[PDB]
Protein backbone atom coordinates (compact mmCIF):
# COMPACT_ATOMS: atom_id res chain seq x y z
CA UNK A 1 0.00 0.00 0.00
CA UNK A 2 1.57 3.29 -1.23
CA UNK A 3 0.83 6.63 0.44
CA UNK A 4 -1.17 4.88 3.17
CA UNK A 5 -0.82 4.47 6.93
CA UNK A 6 -0.94 1.52 9.38
CA UNK A 7 -4.48 0.22 9.91
CA UNK A 8 -6.19 -0.10 13.34
CA UNK A 9 -5.37 -3.61 14.47
CA UNK A 10 -8.21 -6.13 13.74
CA UNK A 11 -10.61 -3.38 12.46
CA UNK A 12 -11.01 -5.30 9.17
CA UNK A 13 -11.92 -8.85 10.46
CA UNK A 14 -12.27 -10.01 6.83
CA UNK A 15 -8.61 -9.26 6.05
CA UNK A 16 -6.74 -12.41 5.01
CA UNK A 17 -3.11 -13.10 4.17
CA UNK A 18 -2.79 -15.73 1.38
CA UNK A 19 0.49 -17.36 2.28
CA UNK A 20 2.99 -19.35 0.31
CA UNK A 21 5.49 -21.50 2.20
CA UNK A 22 4.81 -19.41 5.32
CA UNK A 23 5.47 -16.05 3.58
CA UNK A 24 2.81 -13.46 2.78
CA UNK A 25 2.07 -13.79 -0.92
CA UNK A 26 -1.27 -12.01 -1.48
CA UNK A 27 -4.16 -10.23 0.11
CA UNK A 28 -7.51 -11.93 0.64
CA UNK A 29 -11.00 -11.32 1.96
CA UNK A 30 -13.08 -13.85 3.99
CA UNK A 31 -16.31 -14.03 2.04
CA UNK A 32 -17.88 -17.00 3.96
CA UNK A 33 -17.15 -19.07 7.12
CA UNK A 34 -14.97 -21.54 5.12
CA UNK A 35 -14.10 -19.47 1.99
CA UNK A 36 -11.54 -16.76 1.17
CA UNK A 37 -11.68 -14.65 -2.01
CA UNK A 38 -8.34 -13.55 -3.58
CA UNK A 39 -6.69 -12.95 -7.00
CA UNK A 40 -6.00 -15.85 -9.46
CA UNK A 41 -2.54 -14.60 -10.64
CA UNK A 42 -1.10 -15.08 -7.07
CA UNK A 43 -1.03 -18.77 -7.61
CA UNK A 44 0.15 -18.63 -11.29
CA UNK A 45 3.83 -19.06 -10.34
CA UNK A 46 3.25 -20.70 -6.85
CA UNK A 47 3.92 -24.22 -8.26
CA UNK A 48 4.05 -26.83 -5.39
CA UNK A 49 4.25 -24.16 -2.64
CA UNK A 50 2.11 -24.74 0.52
CA UNK A 51 -0.97 -22.49 0.26
CA UNK A 52 -2.29 -21.29 3.63
CA UNK A 53 -4.55 -18.41 4.73
CA UNK A 54 -3.75 -16.24 7.75
CA UNK A 55 -6.79 -14.93 9.58
CA UNK A 56 -7.12 -12.58 12.54
CA UNK A 57 -3.76 -10.90 11.74
CA UNK A 58 -2.42 -7.34 11.94
CA UNK A 59 1.28 -8.18 12.33
CA UNK A 60 2.52 -10.91 9.96
CA UNK A 61 5.26 -11.89 12.52
CA UNK A 62 4.08 -11.06 16.05
CA UNK A 63 1.90 -13.10 18.39
CA UNK A 64 -1.76 -12.06 18.56
CA UNK A 65 -4.53 -14.13 20.33
CA UNK A 66 -6.70 -13.87 17.17
CA UNK A 67 -4.10 -15.01 14.60
CA UNK A 68 -4.84 -18.43 13.05
CA UNK A 69 -3.18 -20.14 10.06
CA UNK A 70 -5.56 -22.39 8.10
CA UNK A 71 -4.47 -24.95 5.53
CA UNK A 72 -6.28 -24.80 2.16
CA UNK A 73 -8.35 -27.83 1.21
CA UNK A 74 -9.09 -26.76 -2.39
CA UNK A 75 -8.06 -23.73 -4.60
CA UNK A 76 -10.59 -22.62 -7.20
CA UNK A 77 -9.35 -20.00 -9.68
CA UNK A 78 -11.89 -18.57 -12.12
CA UNK A 79 -11.86 -21.02 -15.06
CA UNK A 80 -11.39 -18.28 -17.66
CA UNK A 81 -8.38 -16.69 -15.96
CA UNK A 82 -5.01 -16.99 -17.78
CA UNK A 83 -1.51 -15.53 -17.18
CA UNK A 84 -1.57 -13.45 -20.40
CA UNK A 85 -4.66 -11.36 -19.18
CA UNK A 86 -6.16 -9.42 -16.18
CA UNK A 87 -9.70 -10.69 -16.98
CA UNK A 88 -11.49 -13.00 -14.49
CA UNK A 89 -8.60 -12.62 -11.98
CA UNK A 90 -10.49 -14.22 -9.07
CA UNK A 91 -9.58 -17.14 -6.86
CA UNK A 92 -11.59 -18.97 -4.19
CA UNK A 93 -9.77 -20.79 -1.38
CA UNK A 94 -11.55 -23.42 0.78
CA UNK A 95 -10.22 -23.54 4.35
CA UNK A 96 -9.33 -26.89 6.08
CA UNK A 97 -12.28 -26.18 8.44
CA UNK A 98 -14.79 -23.31 9.06
CA UNK A 99 -13.03 -20.29 10.58
CA UNK A 100 -13.38 -19.40 14.29
CA UNK A 101 -15.42 -16.20 14.02
CA UNK A 102 -14.83 -13.47 16.58
CA UNK A 103 -14.28 -9.69 16.87
CA UNK A 104 -11.13 -10.09 14.72
CA UNK A 105 -12.33 -12.85 12.28
CA UNK A 106 -15.61 -12.15 10.46
CA UNK A 107 -16.75 -12.64 6.81
CA UNK A 108 -17.53 -9.54 4.74
CA UNK A 109 -20.67 -9.02 2.59
CA UNK A 110 -19.81 -8.67 -1.12
CA UNK A 111 -21.67 -6.42 -3.58
CA UNK A 112 -24.27 -8.35 -5.55
CA UNK A 113 -25.86 -5.33 -7.39
CA UNK A 114 -23.90 -5.07 -10.73
CA UNK A 115 -23.63 -1.20 -10.85
CA UNK A 116 -20.46 0.93 -11.17
CA UNK A 117 -19.18 2.91 -8.21
CA UNK A 118 -19.59 6.67 -8.76
CA UNK A 119 -16.19 8.21 -9.84
CA UNK A 120 -14.50 10.17 -7.10
CA UNK A 121 -15.75 7.80 -4.33
CA UNK A 122 -13.16 7.11 -1.69
CA UNK A 123 -12.78 3.38 -1.32
CA UNK A 124 -10.61 1.66 1.23
CA UNK A 125 -7.93 -0.73 0.18
CA UNK A 126 -5.76 -2.62 2.74
CA UNK A 127 -2.78 -4.97 2.45
CA UNK A 128 0.75 -6.05 3.34
CA UNK A 129 2.25 -5.16 -0.08
CA UNK A 130 5.03 -2.67 -1.04
CA UNK A 131 4.88 0.65 0.99
CA UNK A 132 7.64 2.57 -0.75
CA UNK A 133 9.20 3.12 -4.19
CA UNK A 134 12.09 0.95 -2.91
CA UNK A 135 9.88 -2.16 -3.07
CA UNK A 136 9.91 -3.00 0.70
CA UNK A 137 6.93 -4.61 2.62
CA UNK A 138 5.43 -3.81 6.10
CA UNK A 139 5.08 -6.26 9.00
CA UNK A 140 1.68 -4.88 10.10
CA UNK A 141 -1.35 -4.17 7.81
CA UNK A 142 -1.55 -0.81 5.93
CA UNK A 143 -4.59 0.86 4.29
CA UNK A 144 -5.41 3.82 1.97
CA UNK A 145 -8.44 5.69 0.71
CA UNK A 146 -8.48 5.90 -3.11
CA UNK A 147 -10.92 7.76 -5.41
CA UNK A 148 -12.65 5.59 -8.04
CA UNK A 149 -11.75 6.61 -11.60
CA UNK A 150 -14.20 6.35 -14.53
CA UNK A 151 -13.52 3.51 -16.99
CA UNK A 152 -13.44 5.75 -20.13
CA UNK A 153 -10.48 7.71 -18.62
CA UNK A 154 -8.74 4.55 -17.38
CA UNK A 155 -9.03 3.15 -20.99
CA UNK A 156 -7.22 6.13 -22.71
CA UNK A 157 -3.99 5.00 -24.47
CA UNK A 158 -1.90 7.07 -21.95
CA UNK A 159 -3.37 4.83 -19.23
CA UNK A 160 -4.58 1.25 -19.67
CA UNK A 161 -5.35 1.57 -23.45
CA UNK A 162 -8.70 -0.35 -23.44
CA UNK A 163 -7.87 -3.10 -20.90
CA UNK A 164 -10.64 -2.05 -18.44
CA UNK A 165 -13.81 -4.03 -19.17
CA UNK A 166 -17.26 -3.63 -17.59
CA UNK A 167 -16.05 -6.42 -15.20
CA UNK A 168 -13.10 -4.29 -13.96
CA UNK A 169 -12.66 -0.84 -12.30
CA UNK A 170 -9.95 1.70 -11.43
CA UNK A 171 -8.87 4.02 -8.72
CA UNK A 172 -6.47 6.97 -9.03
CA UNK A 173 -2.90 5.94 -8.49
CA UNK A 174 -1.33 9.33 -7.85
CA UNK A 175 1.08 9.04 -4.85
CA UNK A 176 -1.53 6.75 -3.13
CA UNK A 177 -2.02 3.23 -4.66
CA UNK A 178 -2.22 -0.60 -4.22
CA UNK A 179 1.11 -2.37 -5.00
CA UNK A 180 2.53 -5.88 -5.50
CA UNK A 181 1.45 -7.97 -2.47
CA UNK A 182 -1.85 -6.15 -2.22
CA UNK A 183 -3.31 -8.31 -5.04
CA UNK A 184 -6.32 -10.33 -3.96
CA UNK A 185 -7.03 -7.87 -1.16
CA UNK A 186 -10.20 -5.83 -0.69
CA UNK A 187 -11.51 -2.57 -2.23
CA UNK A 188 -14.29 -1.38 0.17
CA UNK A 189 -16.96 1.35 -0.49
CA UNK A 190 -19.81 1.77 1.96
CA UNK A 191 -18.45 -1.05 4.16
CA UNK A 192 -19.40 -3.47 1.36
CA UNK A 193 -16.76 -5.27 -0.67
CA UNK A 194 -16.79 -3.73 -4.17
CA UNK A 195 -13.52 -4.99 -5.71
CA UNK A 196 -10.44 -7.27 -5.45
CA UNK A 197 -6.96 -5.88 -6.18
CA UNK A 198 -5.36 -7.12 -9.43
CA UNK A 199 -2.05 -5.03 -9.31
CA UNK A 200 0.01 -7.96 -10.79
CA UNK A 201 2.90 -6.66 -12.92
CA UNK A 202 2.15 -2.92 -12.75
CA UNK A 203 4.45 -0.44 -10.99
CA UNK A 204 2.61 1.61 -8.38
CA UNK A 205 2.24 5.23 -7.33
CA UNK A 206 2.38 6.62 -10.92
CA UNK A 207 -0.83 8.60 -11.87
CA UNK A 208 -0.26 7.52 -15.52
CA UNK A 209 -1.10 3.92 -14.66
CA UNK A 210 -4.24 3.77 -12.47
CA UNK A 211 -4.90 0.92 -10.04
CA UNK A 212 -6.94 -1.98 -11.36
CA UNK A 213 -9.55 -3.95 -9.23
CA UNK A 214 -11.89 -6.82 -10.24
CA UNK A 215 -15.65 -6.06 -9.69
CA UNK A 216 -17.13 -8.77 -7.38
CA UNK A 217 -20.72 -8.03 -8.54
CA UNK A 218 -19.72 -9.06 -12.08
CA UNK A 219 -18.88 -12.56 -10.76
CA UNK A 220 -21.79 -13.08 -8.33
CA UNK A 221 -23.08 -16.22 -10.15
CA UNK A 222 -19.59 -17.77 -10.12
CA UNK A 223 -18.94 -17.08 -6.38
CA UNK A 224 -22.25 -18.72 -5.36
CA UNK A 225 -21.64 -21.70 -7.75
CA UNK A 226 -18.40 -22.44 -5.93
CA UNK A 227 -19.78 -21.66 -2.41
CA UNK A 228 -22.89 -23.85 -2.87
Amino acid at each position, epitope marked *: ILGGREAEAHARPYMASVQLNGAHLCGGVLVAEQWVLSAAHCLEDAADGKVQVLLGAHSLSQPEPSKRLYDVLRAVPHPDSQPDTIDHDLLLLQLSEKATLGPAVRPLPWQRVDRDVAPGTLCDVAGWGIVNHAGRRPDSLQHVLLPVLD*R*ATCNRRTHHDGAITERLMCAESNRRDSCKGDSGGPLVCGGVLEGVVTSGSRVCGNRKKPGIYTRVASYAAWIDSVLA
Partner: antibody
Amino acid sequence: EVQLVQSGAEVKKPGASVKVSCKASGYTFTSYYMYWVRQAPGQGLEWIGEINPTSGGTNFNEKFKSRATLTVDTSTSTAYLELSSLRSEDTAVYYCAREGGFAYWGQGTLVTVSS
Amino acid sequence: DIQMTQSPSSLSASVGDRVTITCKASQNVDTDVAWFQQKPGKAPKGLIYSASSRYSGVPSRFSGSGSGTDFTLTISSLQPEDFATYYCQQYNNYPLTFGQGTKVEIKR
Protein backbone atom coordinates in the same frame (compact mmCIF):
# COMPACT_ATOMS: atom_id res chain seq x y z
CA GLU B 1 -17.31 -6.54 -35.73
CA VAL B 2 -16.37 -3.08 -34.41
CA GLN B 3 -17.10 -0.17 -36.79
CA LEU B 4 -17.50 3.58 -36.52
CA VAL B 5 -20.17 4.60 -38.99
CA GLN B 6 -20.09 8.34 -39.70
CA SER B 7 -22.68 10.48 -41.48
CA GLY B 8 -22.86 11.42 -45.18
CA ALA B 9 -20.94 14.18 -47.00
CA GLU B 10 -22.14 17.75 -46.50
CA VAL B 11 -22.15 20.86 -48.70
CA LYS B 12 -22.85 23.98 -46.59
CA LYS B 13 -23.20 27.77 -47.19
CA PRO B 14 -20.64 30.00 -45.35
CA GLY B 15 -22.78 30.92 -42.32
CA ALA B 16 -24.42 27.67 -41.18
CA SER B 17 -23.76 24.84 -38.74
CA VAL B 18 -23.17 21.12 -39.51
CA LYS B 19 -23.85 18.04 -37.24
CA VAL B 20 -21.68 15.00 -38.05
CA SER B 21 -22.83 11.81 -36.41
CA CYS B 22 -20.70 8.74 -35.63
CA LYS B 23 -22.45 5.53 -34.46
CA ALA B 24 -20.33 2.92 -32.69
CA SER B 25 -21.16 -0.79 -32.63
CA GLY B 26 -19.26 -3.92 -31.60
CA TYR B 27 -18.03 -2.60 -28.22
CA THR B 28 -19.30 -0.88 -25.05
CA PHE B 29 -19.53 2.76 -26.31
CA THR B 30 -19.35 4.19 -22.74
CA SER B 31 -16.12 2.26 -22.01
CA TYR B 32 -13.97 4.58 -24.25
CA TYR B 33 -13.35 8.23 -25.10
CA MET B 34 -14.17 9.30 -28.67
CA TYR B 35 -11.89 11.77 -30.32
CA TRP B 36 -12.30 13.84 -33.48
CA VAL B 37 -9.68 14.69 -36.16
CA ARG B 38 -9.88 17.11 -39.13
CA GLN B 39 -7.97 16.82 -42.43
CA ALA B 40 -8.19 19.71 -44.90
CA PRO B 41 -7.61 18.88 -48.66
CA GLY B 42 -4.01 17.75 -49.28
CA GLN B 43 -3.15 18.62 -45.65
CA GLY B 44 -2.24 16.78 -42.47
CA LEU B 45 -4.25 15.69 -39.47
CA GLU B 46 -5.53 18.04 -36.75
CA TRP B 47 -6.77 16.93 -33.33
CA ILE B 48 -10.14 18.69 -32.61
CA GLY B 49 -11.12 17.24 -29.25
CA GLU B 50 -12.58 14.34 -27.26
CA ILE B 51 -15.65 13.31 -25.26
CA ASN B 52 -16.21 11.07 -22.23
CA PRO B 53 -19.51 9.23 -22.96
CA THR B 54 -20.16 8.46 -19.28
CA SER B 55 -19.89 12.10 -17.96
CA GLY B 56 -20.33 14.06 -21.20
CA GLY B 57 -17.08 15.82 -20.35
CA THR B 58 -14.96 17.23 -23.17
CA ASN B 59 -11.29 18.25 -23.82
CA PHE B 60 -10.76 20.55 -26.79
CA ASN B 61 -7.99 21.98 -28.89
CA GLU B 62 -8.25 25.80 -28.26
CA LYS B 63 -8.56 26.40 -32.06
CA PHE B 64 -12.09 24.84 -32.07
CA LYS B 65 -13.50 25.27 -28.51
CA SER B 66 -15.25 28.47 -29.81
CA ARG B 67 -17.44 26.99 -32.63
CA ALA B 68 -17.15 23.20 -32.05
CA THR B 69 -19.51 21.15 -29.86
CA LEU B 70 -19.12 17.50 -28.86
CA THR B 71 -22.22 15.57 -27.63
CA VAL B 72 -23.13 11.92 -26.94
CA ASP B 73 -26.42 9.96 -27.10
CA THR B 74 -25.67 7.03 -24.77
CA SER B 75 -29.08 5.42 -25.51
CA THR B 76 -28.09 5.10 -29.22
CA SER B 77 -24.27 4.91 -28.71
CA THR B 78 -23.58 7.87 -31.09
CA ALA B 79 -21.01 10.67 -30.76
CA TYR B 80 -21.79 14.00 -32.43
CA LEU B 81 -19.61 16.85 -33.76
CA GLU B 82 -21.31 20.18 -34.27
CA LEU B 83 -19.29 22.82 -36.07
CA SER B 84 -21.12 26.19 -36.25
CA SER B 85 -20.71 29.57 -38.03
CA LEU B 86 -18.83 27.88 -40.90
CA ARG B 87 -16.25 29.45 -43.31
CA SER B 88 -14.32 28.12 -46.41
CA GLU B 89 -11.36 27.17 -44.12
CA ASP B 90 -13.70 24.64 -42.42
CA THR B 91 -13.80 22.69 -45.71
CA ALA B 92 -12.25 19.35 -44.57
CA VAL B 93 -12.70 15.60 -43.97
CA TYR B 94 -13.85 15.09 -40.35
CA TYR B 95 -13.07 11.70 -38.63
CA CYS B 96 -14.30 10.25 -35.31
CA ALA B 97 -11.81 7.76 -33.77
CA ARG B 98 -11.86 5.58 -30.63
CA GLU B 99 -9.47 6.71 -27.84
CA GLY B 100 -8.23 3.41 -26.35
CA GLY B 101 -7.68 -0.16 -27.57
CA PHE B 102 -7.47 -0.99 -31.32
CA ALA B 103 -7.15 2.15 -33.53
CA TYR B 104 -10.71 2.21 -34.92
CA TRP B 105 -11.69 5.16 -37.12
CA GLY B 106 -14.77 6.14 -39.09
CA GLN B 107 -14.84 6.25 -42.92
CA GLY B 108 -14.84 10.11 -42.62
CA THR B 109 -17.36 12.92 -43.28
CA LEU B 110 -16.51 15.47 -45.96
CA VAL B 111 -17.73 19.00 -45.17
CA THR B 112 -17.51 21.48 -48.06
CA VAL B 113 -18.05 25.15 -47.01
CA SER B 114 -18.71 27.27 -50.12
CA SER B 115 -20.87 30.20 -51.27
CA ASP C 1 1.74 22.97 -27.34
CA ILE C 2 3.94 19.95 -28.14
CA GLN C 3 5.27 19.96 -31.71
CA MET C 4 5.92 16.80 -33.62
CA THR C 5 8.53 17.50 -36.23
CA GLN C 6 8.48 14.67 -38.74
CA SER C 7 11.49 14.07 -40.99
CA PRO C 8 11.89 13.77 -43.90
CA SER C 9 8.83 15.25 -45.65
CA SER C 10 9.34 12.99 -48.69
CA LEU C 11 11.42 9.79 -49.03
CA SER C 12 12.33 7.82 -52.14
CA ALA C 13 12.98 4.10 -51.80
CA SER C 14 13.11 0.77 -53.64
CA VAL C 15 11.09 -2.37 -52.84
CA GLY C 16 13.08 -4.32 -50.25
CA ASP C 17 14.80 -1.33 -48.64
CA ARG C 18 15.17 -0.55 -44.93
CA VAL C 19 13.47 2.80 -44.42
CA THR C 20 13.65 5.26 -41.51
CA ILE C 21 10.98 7.90 -40.67
CA THR C 22 11.87 10.09 -37.66
CA CYS C 23 9.64 12.20 -35.37
CA LYS C 24 10.85 14.94 -32.98
CA ALA C 25 8.77 15.95 -29.99
CA SER C 26 9.61 19.49 -28.74
CA GLN C 27 9.31 18.13 -25.14
CA ASN C 28 9.38 14.74 -23.40
CA VAL C 29 6.22 12.79 -24.37
CA ASP C 30 7.47 9.54 -22.65
CA THR C 31 6.35 6.68 -25.00
CA ASP C 32 2.87 8.13 -25.70
CA VAL C 33 3.53 7.99 -29.47
CA ALA C 34 1.55 6.43 -32.30
CA TRP C 35 2.15 5.97 -36.06
CA PHE C 36 -0.44 5.92 -38.85
CA GLN C 37 -0.40 4.92 -42.45
CA GLN C 38 -2.57 6.78 -44.93
CA LYS C 39 -3.17 5.94 -48.57
CA PRO C 40 -4.82 8.48 -51.03
CA GLY C 41 -8.54 9.01 -50.43
CA LYS C 42 -8.51 6.66 -47.39
CA ALA C 43 -8.79 7.00 -43.60
CA PRO C 44 -5.58 6.72 -41.49
CA LYS C 45 -4.67 3.17 -40.36
CA GLY C 46 -3.14 2.58 -36.92
CA LEU C 47 0.33 0.93 -37.13
CA ILE C 48 2.24 1.50 -33.86
CA TYR C 49 1.14 2.69 -30.39
CA SER C 50 3.15 3.16 -27.15
CA ALA C 51 6.08 4.16 -29.46
CA SER C 52 7.10 0.43 -30.06
CA SER C 53 3.95 -1.81 -29.86
CA ARG C 54 2.32 -2.97 -33.11
CA TYR C 55 -1.49 -3.01 -33.54
CA SER C 56 -3.02 -6.47 -34.28
CA GLY C 57 -2.74 -7.38 -37.97
CA VAL C 58 0.18 -4.98 -38.63
CA PRO C 59 3.02 -6.91 -40.40
CA SER C 60 6.31 -7.65 -38.52
CA ARG C 61 8.26 -5.38 -41.01
CA PHE C 62 6.76 -2.30 -39.20
CA SER C 63 8.54 -1.35 -35.95
CA GLY C 64 8.68 1.66 -33.65
CA SER C 65 11.41 2.94 -31.36
CA GLY C 66 12.04 5.84 -29.02
CA SER C 67 11.36 7.24 -25.59
CA GLY C 68 11.25 10.90 -24.66
CA THR C 69 11.68 13.28 -27.60
CA ASP C 70 13.10 11.30 -30.58
CA PHE C 71 10.88 8.57 -32.17
CA THR C 72 11.42 6.31 -35.22
CA LEU C 73 9.23 4.24 -37.55
CA THR C 74 11.17 1.54 -39.42
CA ILE C 75 10.15 -0.56 -42.45
CA SER C 76 12.69 -3.46 -42.50
CA SER C 77 11.88 -4.67 -46.06
CA LEU C 78 9.69 -2.17 -48.01
CA GLN C 79 6.71 -3.86 -49.87
CA PRO C 80 4.58 -2.26 -52.73
CA GLU C 81 1.58 -1.88 -50.35
CA ASP C 82 3.87 0.39 -48.16
CA PHE C 83 4.16 3.39 -50.48
CA ALA C 84 2.00 5.81 -48.51
CA THR C 85 2.05 8.77 -46.16
CA TYR C 86 3.03 8.15 -42.54
CA TYR C 87 2.08 10.41 -39.61
CA CYS C 88 3.38 10.39 -35.99
CA GLN C 89 1.04 11.34 -33.14
CA GLN C 90 1.66 12.47 -29.57
CA TYR C 91 -1.00 11.49 -26.96
CA ASN C 92 0.93 12.53 -23.75
CA ASN C 93 -0.36 16.12 -23.42
CA TYR C 94 -3.41 18.16 -24.50
CA PRO C 95 -3.91 19.01 -27.29
CA LEU C 96 -3.00 15.75 -29.02
CA THR C 97 -0.67 16.71 -31.93
CA PHE C 98 0.39 15.14 -35.29
CA GLY C 99 3.50 15.38 -37.48
CA GLN C 100 3.46 17.07 -40.90
CA GLY C 101 3.60 13.62 -42.59
CA THR C 102 6.15 11.64 -44.63
CA LYS C 103 5.29 10.49 -48.14
CA VAL C 104 7.16 7.31 -49.18
CA GLU C 105 7.69 7.17 -52.97
CA ILE C 106 9.03 4.53 -55.35
CA LYS C 107 12.58 5.30 -56.42
CA ARG C 108 13.24 5.00 -60.20
